[PDB]
Design a protein around this ligand. Structure first.
Ligand SMILES: [Cl-]
Length: 129
């Protein structure tokens, strides 16, 4: 499913992401925009053989099992396919584990390069939240 900006902001707020570990909702909407263009079915293969899945492009080396990433961990304990659902619960739950992990949102290369230090509140402007 391809989300609208405000529809995603409301779903993320509902699943407890607004100010999770100190990151305002705008940060998570911005990351989702530049990771997946709001498309839950986005996948992208990396040079190392890992794949990134879903709205937040969570990576198979560490976080989910896709059966094709040799010697990967599955720290979120989910098949990577569960990250591609129109329901974002699995992505949200796994994102909360990633961002607690020590590097915060810098784990998302698009957030670091495109969102970090920007007026991220613009991402939720106009939305009924
Ligand atoms: Cl942090």
């Amino acid at each position: 499913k391809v989300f609208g900006r405000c529809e995603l902001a409301a779903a993320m707020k509902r699943h407890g992401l607004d100010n999770y570990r100190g990151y305002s909702l705008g940060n998570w909407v911005c990351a989702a925009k530049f990771e997946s263009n709001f498309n839950t079915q986005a996948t992208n293969r990396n040079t190392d053989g890992s794949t990134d899945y879903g709205i937040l492009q969570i990576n198979s080396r560490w976080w989910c099992n896709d059966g094709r990433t040799p010697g990967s961990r599955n720290l979120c304990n989910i098949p990577c396919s569960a990250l591609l659902s129109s329901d974002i619960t699995a992505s949200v739950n796994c994102a909360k584990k990633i961002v607690s992990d020590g590097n915060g949102m810098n784990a998302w290369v698009a957030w670091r390069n495109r969102c970090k230090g920007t007026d991220v509140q613009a991402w939720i402007r106009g939305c009924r939240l």
